[PDB]
């Protein structure tokens, strides 16, 4: 497991680099703390119009204005 | 005349198909199918399919017809062809003459003779190409489609290596 | 033999691309989304034999959205009568159908 | 025909309503015939491999019989289920459409005139 | 060619002999053109002239069968004054079989085609009478 | 329906009659087959772009890929035929009549 | 079928916002802050009615509230706004990031003379709630009555009477 | 061929057919057919001789043409319906093109002309796959589109397949062409009952697959591809002659055998729909099939043809061939008629 | 439209230069089939189809289904690598490696 | 225009539903000149 790796690194370093880069491509997004922020930035990007809701009378979490406190915020993206 | 540009490109498309389908030689047939692929790309580009038209250029013409002309150059090195070509050309221009003098025709289906600009949408898509987003959704929504296509391509590699070996 | 493995296992292998009124990327509607939704909600569950006769109005509206044959035939009739009246001289186009009015917004 | 009946719950060999039905007995003559077919398969399996037909591989003959009886029991359960579904749908459709299934007036043969044809 | 059969069967038997003869001739000509098309398809003739000779031969053979069939059937319906009678098409089918034997220049093929085509045309008349269906619509 | 669909269908039928009437070469048959595929690509693409049917935008690519893989298989068969007789003439492929 | 009902040319007359798209993009964030309410009333009406003909008056309120937005810029801060949208207008993609100091001068003059705060990153993309007096459309698709479904299966499943009844089989 | 590669390729043949059977989208139907054809081409070129390359080329051309016609039918359906659901088609032109494409994939007459050539060109195991497993996917597509199948087209294809498959097998001495024309006639019987009752279509398909797999397994077990090599079987394995006798009498539909079961039920479903002439002429035309089956039973089991001297060497060696499921298939292909009402499990 | 003008101008300049080069000096009086090349062309075609599957990735990274997208992207590049590894180990990449 | 034409209902919908349908390109620009038609239907596609 150690002589084999040195043998293939001496003979075929292109393939050793290929399997190492591919293995780091596979396993490292599951170990990265910033993989969550990729999803958050993609869902925080407003391609569509934010179609407003009819105020039935009881929606305390939905704002009446963009500059109201309630609603989803992007302070994490300005700060990071 | 310029409002009929997709129609004119489609006429050139049928003329190219009558060109190679009359089968003069597989190299001139390859050339006719190349010219047809280019003008069909132009049709697709004029309906707003930029990526699909560039796939006709990159994959159909630049990938597959290259291999066709390659195999043809490795394998290869009339009156029926010319009569068949003028037959298909006269059939196509009789179709053109009828659907232009009548603004309607019926070969098997009913066809309008107006310029094919009339059917389009009158809005916008914002900050995306809808065709690009639907092709991008192959990785998000088309998981089973990715699986069956990639498995068929791997099997295609294996099948070509089996049948070309002779052992 | 349509073995309905997708409904049996609860997996969605290909229902997503099946209709235009399904969930699209970025909520992009098809041009005939309302007509297809009306025809699907009409014909749902009643079987194809009853759907041929009982949902004919929604299906004809949806086919005419998809191919626009009646619309193009009507535009053919209007444009042909207009060309006949231009040739007879019994009509003149207005300035807003000639390009002399500097559009709205 | 009945393919929309078993389409709300697909790929069920025996649905849950099939358990309302009495199962086939183990002395069902159809099931005994399927066991006989397993015994015949065991005899042909000895015959084509040139084994002594009745004597060789009694474990194999018994697994032939057992496997055919095992598959055939569930096949008979599904058979009886599908004919029960057929009759249930028939009776529910007749009960829901009385205008299509009227009660015909039965006449006795004192009123019924039949033409006589002499054999002479 | 479904309208060819319709314009054959729309006319009553023993009423208009020339148009019944022409309609049966056209049915025979269409069948001969189909046979000629598959004949020059699956068996390549040695020339274009041999191909059009085979096409004209098969088309005129089947058209003469149809012509003499419709003529003999309508004349037998006129002289017997029985339009709804399969014996008329029995005689017409035997006349068409004798025509098929005369085109192939043989008597045995003529008698065999007389018998089988006469019984076939009699069965077609009986099926038109009692409403027998060959391509029956699914009903149950 | 719209006027371009007439020509794309007519292109399909022209390449269909080319593929259903061989002259001599197997390669010309494969070219007519891929012309049929090209016209199916164009017709599918014009429908899907006209309808704004977003998820079917990936459909013609799939239609391209599979069929070009099919074309690859066809070329390989042709080559093995051409490794038997020297040409790709369809009249050499008649051993199976008996 | 029926005659389509179009509003007249008098019912479509409104005082237009005759400014270019760089002017609009330069004023966009303060416009989304200040003209929030009639815009969201119009877009709620536009997604609920699914018909532009039913949304004209609200749309006119949009075209009434935008102009009052620009006049209040024209009365107070015409020159920093002009210097800012000119710099926006130079660019081919009309970048905000090329124009940050003219933006800072415009935001300074607007926050001083009018008290308007520019919205933060994320605020104008929020889904808000709108209080309307118009009723909810009960049938916006104008759908007719759906066909009645087929009767379901019910009842206990009894065995088949005398079996399969297939020609001579008793089971 | 590498055995691992053989297993992956056979699983890919199975996967293509299974994708056809389980998918609700027309593109995945078409993908299943493409995957199936691509994977089955090496099974036909397994032995690498010019007859297999010719058979694979003819198979490729017919199945590729059918695949393009299928995709055009799908595309016309998308025009006139805006959707991709595998259900009835919404245009009669698309219905005609899809019925033609599926008839070409089945090799139904007058698209039958590849089936004896391709079956003769390939080994017995790959012709077993071609005549049994490759019918399964197009029959399932025909099953789902039957509300739009034109009646006159499918019945024309059915009777034309039954007549042409009957007359085609009369002239044959090669066993693979006999099985191919027998296949053409049995597919005609399957499509004739399709619009009336597709459960009887499934019954005829299953009984045909059992009997055809039995006959191919007997031919593989005796290494016989001709009538005259099959006639040596009595002097080598006399039980195999009894098995080919009972299986060929069953494929002729003679009661009390199991192959009487489909056609009887098919007639039982065609006369309920007031079609009397058509199952009558179909059953009389199947006597042609029974005639060349009887020819094979005369040459193999009911007479003893002359053998050769070298046969005495083969008396000293037992059959080491895996005759997989051959006693089970032989029993199911012959003794299943008392269990005829089991067909309701196919509903 | 500007693109069609540019393509027409490039084609016209190329045809004009070719017409000059074939008709300006007119003023003065004065193979066996190789299986290996076919196999590398078919390997190009198959990997080019696999590339056509890989081409919407810069747009596919913009999705909100990133776990599925990353899985399918790595699976397609992996199947391209398995195609190459099968081509390698079965001596398909030999004498033109 | 459509006064001489018998049986013509001006503004007759081709749809059975009375729901608003998004206007087609030929419905809006059908009676206008070819420059406006070409702009509104191929301007974004042909732009650069
Ligand atoms: C039972 C029927 C199936 C038997 C199959 C095997 C037959 C066999 O090999 O027998 C040989 C064996 C004796 O042979 P052997 O000496 O040991 O060794 C072989 C010889 O060396 C043989 O010598 P040879 O091979 O060297 O040369 C002679 C040659 C002779 O052959 C020739 O020369 C060529 C052929 C001659 C002309 C053809 C004659 C007809 C043959 C076909 C039958 C057609 C009619 C069938 C129905 C009509 C429709 C087709 O070949 C044979 O004799 C080979 C043996 C086969 C003979 C019998 C064939 C039967 C199988 C096919 C029929 C049954 C299945 C299909 C039925 C269809 C629908 C009903 O016979 C028996 O043992 C018979 C069975 C006796 C005991 C029965 C006990 C029954 C108990 C039942 C209860 C227990 C189970 C409970 C189950 C339920 C639990 C819940
Ligand atoms: C069909 C009607 C017959 C037409 C075809 C005749 C045979 C083919 C032929 O022409 O071969 C010449 C020619 C070369 O053959 P060849 O070398 O002359 O061979 C004969 C030898 O020369 C041998 O010398 P030959 O020419 O002197 O003898 C030929 C012999 C003529 O026979 C004789 O010379 C002696 C026997 C007298 C005539 C037969 C009397 C049969 C009476 C009916 C049975 C008894 C019923 C009793 C009922 C009582 C109450 C009514 O005729 C036959 O063998 C044909 C018999 C009938 C054929 C159809 C049988 C189908 C049975 C299906 C189940 C029922 O064949 C070809 O080139 C093939 C194509 C020929 C032209 C197309 C065929 C005509 C199609 C017309 C439309 C028919 C529609 C179907 C109606 C019936 C089915 C629903
Ligand atoms: C449900 C549908 C089932 C369809 C059939 C599935 C199995 C056959 C297909 C695959 C195959 O060839 O497998 C080998 C195959 C034997 O086929 P073969 O090579 O032609 O047989 C020749 C000798 O049996 C080989 O003799 P040997 O000396 O090499 O070894 C003796 C062997 C040793 O056995 C073992 O080693 C088994 C123990 C290990 C099993 C796996 C454990 C993990 O004994 C047997 O296999 C006795 C024969 C068993 C019966 C074969 C047919 C099965 C029934 C098919 C359905 C019948 C339905 C009739 C309905 C009629 C009315 C419609 O099966 C087995 O070895 C095991 C059979 C287990 C049957 C279980 C049935 C219930 C399942 C739930
Ligand atoms: C308290 C807990 C414990 C209680 C225990 C109670 C039982 C104690 C005793 C244990 C044994 C019981 C056996 C089962 C009951 C009796 C079944 C029966 O006979 O049904 C009469 C059945 C109908 O008569 P039935 O008078 O209306 O009913 C009397 C009972 O109520 C019949 O009852 P069912 O109305 O419920 O019957 C139902 C239905 C009644 O049937 C029907 O609804 C009519 C349709 C029947 C099928 C017709 C098929 C026609 C085409 C194929 C012809 C086959 C070729 C002939 C055979 C070739 C040689 C192998 O049967 C079927 O659907 C099954 C199909 C036929 C199989 C019968 C059972 C066979 C088991 C043993 C097999 C051994 C080989 C036999 C020969 C192979 C062929 C069967 O008779 C026939 O159809 C005639 C054939 C005779 C059948 C076989 C006789 C069984 C005993 C054979 C022993 C000797 C074997 C010799 C060696 C092997 C042969 C070489
Ligand atoms: C799991 C991660 C994802 C893996 C898949 C994606 C890979 C991305 C790169 C694409 C590679 C595709 C083609 C690979 C072909 C492998 C087979 C091969 O090359 O075998 C032959 C070779 C000996 O070479 P030869 O045949 O003589 O060729 C002439 C040159 N001497 O034999 C050799 O040289 C032996 C090669 C195999 C051993 C290499 C070990 C490298 C280990 C790196 C560290 C660990 C990385 C983590 C992943 C585990 C890898 C085992
Ligand atoms: C051999 C028996 C093996 C049975 C294993 C279990 C199979 C199973 O559960 O199948 C479900 C299926 C009923 O499913 P369903 O959706 O009704 O099928 C419609 C198809 N036209 O059930 C069936 O189709 C059972 C009948 C299959 C019989 C095939 C061999 C005879
Ligand atoms: C009535 C007129 C029919 C005209 C078409 C059939 C004539 C024919 O068979 O032509 C022969 C032709 C083969 O051409 P040929 O010249 O023989 O080839 C050798 C190379 N010099 O054969 C062919 O080209 C075969 C296909 C011809 C078309 C068949 C269908 C239409 C004609 C028959 C039905 C009418
Ligand atoms: C041995 C062979 C025995 C064949 C027996 C055939 C029995 C006749 C069945 C076809 C027939 O003639 O049916 C009668 C039918 C006319 O009756 P009807 O149903 O009212 O048709 C009008 C349609 N609106 O007519 C029709 O449906 C159309 C005419 C059918 C004629 C069939 C034969 C045509 C010539 C040979 C091909």
Swiss-Prot record, chain B:
Q: Which GO terms describe its biological process?
A: mitochondrial electron transport, NADH to ubiquinone; mitochondrial respiratory chain complex I assembly
Into which EC class is this enzyme placed? Answer: translocase
User: What is the reaction catalyzed?
Assistant: a ubiquinone + NADH + 5 H(+)(in) = a ubiquinol + NAD(+) + 4 H(+)(out)
Q: Which GO terms describe its molecular function?
A: NADH dehydrogenase (ubiquinone) activity
Membrane-spanning ranges: 1-21, 25-45, 47-67, 80-100, 141-161
**UniProt topology in membrane:** Multi-pass membrane protein
**Keyword Aminoacyl-tRNA synthetase found:** no
Q: Where in the cell is it found?
A: Mitochondrion inner membrane
Quote the InterPro entries the UniProt record gives: ComplexI_Subunit6 (IPR050269), NADH_UbQ/plastoQ_OxRdtase_su6 (IPR001457), Nuo/plastoQ_OxRdtase_6_NuoJ (IPR042106)
Instruction: Tell me which GO cellular component terms the UniProt record holds.
Output: mitochondrial inner membrane; respiratory chain complex I
Supply the alphabetized keyword list.
Electron transport, Membrane, Mitochondrion, Mitochondrion inner membrane, NAD, Respiratory chain, Translocase, Transmembrane, Transmembrane helix, Transport, Ubiquinone
Enzyme Commission number(s) from the entry: 7.1.1.2
| UniProt xrefs under PANTHER family | NADH UBIQUINONE OXIDOREDUCTASE SUBUNIT ND6, NADH-UBIQUINONE OXIDOREDUCTASE CHAIN 6
Q: Which family does it belong to?
A: Belongs to the complex I subunit 6 family.
SUBUNIT field: Core subunit of respiratory chain NADH dehydrogenase (Complex I) which is composed of 45 different subunits.
Reported function? Core subunit of the mitochondrial membrane respiratory chain NADH dehydrogenase (Complex I) which catalyzes electron transfer from NADH through the respiratory chain, using ubiquinone as an electron acceptor. Essential for the catalytic activity and assembly of complex I.
Tell me what this protein is called.
Answer: NADH-ubiquinone oxidoreductase chain 6
Organism in which the protein naturally occurs: Ovis aries
From Swiss-Prot, chain F:
- The encoding gene is MT-ND4L
**Signal peptide (residue range):** none
Q: What is the lineage of its organism?
A: Eukaryota, Metazoa, Chordata, Craniata, Vertebrata
Record key words, sorted: Electron transport, Membrane, Mitochondrion, Mitochondrion inner membrane, NAD, Respiratory chain, Translocase, Transmembrane, Transmembrane helix, Transport, Ubiquinone
Q: Which family does it belong to?
A: Belongs to the complex I subunit 4L family.
**Catalytic reactions of this protein:** a ubiquinone + NADH + 5 H(+)(in) = a ubiquinol + NAD(+) + 4 H(+)(out)
Please describe what this protein does.
Core subunit of the mitochondrial membrane respiratory chain NADH dehydrogenase (Complex I) which catalyzes electron transfer from NADH through the respiratory chain, using ubiquinone as an electron acceptor. Part of the enzyme membrane arm which is embedded in the lipid bilayer and involved in proton translocation.
- What's one GO BP annotation on this UniProt entry? ATP synthesis coupled electron transport
**According to its UniProt record, what is one Pfam family this protein matches?**
Oxidored_q2
Subunit text: Core subunit of respiratory chain NADH dehydrogenase (Complex I) which is composed of 45 different subunits.
Q: Where in the cell is it found?
A: Mitochondrion inner membrane
Can you tell which superkingdom this protein's organism belongs to? Eukaryota
| EC number(s) given by UniProt | 7.1.1.2
Q: What class of enzyme is it?
A: translocase
Please provide, in alphabetical order, the Gene Ontology terms of the cellular component aspect for this entry: mitochondrial inner membrane; respiratory chain complex I
Listed name of the protein: NADH-ubiquinone oxidoreductase chain 4L
What GO annotations for molecular function exist for this entry?
NADH dehydrogenase (ubiquinone) activity
Q: What is its main location?
A: mitochondrion
Spans through the membrane: 1-21, 29-49, 61-81
Topology relative to the membrane, per the entry? Answer: Multi-pass membrane protein
UniProtKB/Swiss-Prot annotation, chain H:
InterPro entries on file: Complex_I_Subunit_2, NADH_DH_su2_C, NADH_UbQ_OxRdtase_chain2, ND/Mrp_TM
Which species expresses this protein natively? Ovis aries (Sheep)
Annotated membrane topology: Multi-pass membrane protein
- Tell me where in or outside the cell this protein is found: Mitochondrion inner membrane
* Major site of localization recorded for this protein: mitochondrion
Q: In the UniProt record, does the keyword Transferase occur? A: no
Name the catalysed reactions.
a ubiquinone + NADH + 5 H(+)(in) = a ubiquinol + NAD(+) + 4 H(+)(out)
Q: How does it assemble?
A: Core subunit of respiratory chain NADH dehydrogenase (Complex I) which is composed of 45 different subunits. Interacts with TMEM242.
Q: Name one Pfam family in it.
A: Proton_antipo_M
What is the protein's given name? NADH-ubiquinone oxidoreductase chain 2
Q: List the disulfide bonds.
A: none
| EC number assigned by the record | 7.1.1.2
An example molecular function term from Gene Ontology annotations? NADH dehydrogenase (ubiquinone) activity
Q: Could you say which protein family the record assigns here?
A: Belongs to the complex I subunit 2 family.
> Its biological function?
Core subunit of the mitochondrial membrane respiratory chain NADH dehydrogenase (Complex I) which catalyzes electron transfer from NADH through the respiratory chain, using ubiquinone as an electron acceptor. Essential for the catalytic activity and assembly of complex I.
Keyword terms, alphabetized: Electron transport, Membrane, Mitochondrion, Mitochondrion inner membrane, NAD, Respiratory chain, Translocase, Transmembrane, Transmembrane helix, Transport, Ubiquinone
Has keyword Membrane? yes
Where exactly are the transmembrane stretches of this chain?
3-23, 25-45, 67-87, 96-116, 122-142, 145-165, 178-198, 200-220, 237-257, 274-294, 325-345
Q: Which domain of life is it from?
A: Eukaryota
Offer a single GO CC term for the protein: respiratory chain complex I
Q: Which GO terms describe its biological process?
A: mitochondrial electron transport, NADH to ubiquinone; mitochondrial respiratory chain complex I assembly; reactive oxygen species metabolic process
From Swiss-Prot, chain I:
Q: Which GO terms describe its cellular component?
A: mitochondrial inner membrane; respiratory chain complex I
The primary location reported for this protein is mitochondrion
Query: What membrane topology does the UniProt entry give?
Result: Multi-pass membrane protein
Q: Which Pfam families match?
A: Oxidored_q4
User: What InterPro entries has UniProt attached to this entry?
Assistant: NADH_UbQ/plastoQ_OxRdtase_su3 (IPR000440), NDAH_ubi_oxred_su3_sf (IPR038430)
Indicate the enzyme's highest-level EC class.
translocase
Drop me one GO molecular function for this one.
NADH dehydrogenase (ubiquinone) activity
* Keyword Transcription among UniProt keywords: no
What high-level taxonomic lineage is stated for the organism?
Eukaryota, Metazoa, Chordata, Craniata, Vertebrata
What are the EC numbers? 7.1.1.2
Task: Fetch the Gene3D superfamilies from UniProt.
Answer: NADH:ubiquinone/plastoquinone oxidoreductase, chain 3 (1.20.58.1610)
Q: Where in the cell is it found?
A: Mitochondrion inner membrane
UniProt name for this protein: NADH-ubiquinone oxidoreductase chain 3
Q: Which UniProt keywords apply?
A: Electron transport, Membrane, Mitochondrion, Mitochondrion inner membrane, NAD, Respiratory chain, Translocase, Transmembrane, Transmembrane helix, Transport, Ubiquinone
Reaction(s) this enzyme catalyzes, per UniProt: a ubiquinone + NADH + 5 H(+)(in) = a ubiquinol + NAD(+) + 4 H(+)(out)
Transmembrane domains' residue ranges:
3-23, 37-57, 66-86
